[PDB]
Homo-oligomer: A and B are copies of this chain.
Amino acid sequence: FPMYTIPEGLGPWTPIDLSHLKCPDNTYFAEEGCNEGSKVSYLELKPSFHSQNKVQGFTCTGIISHFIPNQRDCRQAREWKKEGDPRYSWLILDPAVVEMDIYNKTMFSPVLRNGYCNFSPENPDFCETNHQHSIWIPEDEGRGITCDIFQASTGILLKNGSKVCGFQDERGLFRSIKGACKMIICGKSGVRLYDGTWVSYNSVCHTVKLDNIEESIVRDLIKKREECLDALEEVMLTRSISFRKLSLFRKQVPGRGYVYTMINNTMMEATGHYKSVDNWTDILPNPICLMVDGKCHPGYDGVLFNGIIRDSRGKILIPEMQSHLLRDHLELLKRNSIPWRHPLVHYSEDLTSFAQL
């Protein structure tokens, strides 16, 4: 476990719900007798693609007693309110972020009926929401779907004579072949590696295979994960989080993983390629500049990503780093409120509780 990790080539931020935060996958396999290879021109996935499984949406509830709304007017209602004249009819409650896999494009969320939904002839452009009379709609009719998900990059396919022991990234990251498998995405053939990255290079598929690891390291990963899950348990309870606690969601080993922040009291997600950091100067060459992708990362409203913030005098507070310095800071400790809980998440079975709005 390096002292620290910092994302390389960070993707754009997507707003998410609290329930979307996931504890990092901290597995990383070493390089042994596998160092030489041939440079392989291959395309891999752009960082936005890994934020394609979060589809923005709103919900719609009709009334005079509640009635079953239909998509067309729900949209023009949702298009108003985005600027406001009538304010009522169809009650529009947002954000309603859902997950969806790239393959069947199935949607998954507690606000959707039976936990999930699939666009069908009977619902071509909406989901039912296990409410009496509320239907869920995405914010882009096309659900931010696209296949412009690849870019050119140069790596080295690693020799072991004839056989392939692994891969090495354009960044330099050794990614092994231990948990690699072959899979087409968007009509291109490529390899799917344990780490999460997909690469286009062809030779010869949530879970985790953990049989070839020393007890000591599999115990440490379980330690790490449980720590993070307690924090998640408490974030979900209190709808709040401290920048300290948020740092437990930072992928602790080099590799692809999520990067988390808070903007406008909403949790935000992006994808990056994590690189080991050995010296605080390597990412803070002076106290006021967090170096990410060769640029000072400015942040927003004093908040960078992954629990990093900026104090009252402009200095960067990296939780892990302050903690190793025994220098406590109330700003790292204060609970940041994430108020929004969507009404129809915990809903069951003349006018609902969301008569409030």
Contacts and interface: CB of A to CB of B under 8 A. Distances in A.
A225 B333 contact: no
A164 interface: no
A25 B326 CA distance: 9
A12 interface: no
A352 interface: no
A151 interface: no
Given A19-B330, A22-B328, A330-B19, A323 B233 contact: no
A238 interface: yes
B208 A325 contact: yes
Interface string A231-264: 0110011101010110000000000000000000
A152 interface: no
A324 B211 CA distance: 11
Contacts of A240: 237
Given A236-B333, A312-B115, A333-B229, A207 B327 contact: yes
26 contacts: A19-B330, A22-B328, A115-B312, A207-B327, A208-B326, A208-B327, A209-B325, A210-B325, A210-B326, A221-B326, A222-B323, A222-B324, A222-B326, A225-B323, A225-B326, A225-B328, A229-B244, A229-B328, A229-B333, A233-B244, A233-B245, A233-B333, A233-B335, A236-B333, A236-B334, A237-B240
Contacts of A242: 233
Interface string A251-280: 000000000000000000000000000000
B208 A335 contact: no
Copies of this chain, complex-wide, total: 3
A243 to B, nearest CB: 11
Interface of A: 19, 22-23, 25, 115, 207-210, 221-222, 225-226, 229, 232-233, 236-238, 240, 242, 244-245, 312, 323-328, 330, 333-335
Contacts of A333: 229, 232-233, 236
A104 to B, nearest CB: 16
A267 to B, nearest CB: 15
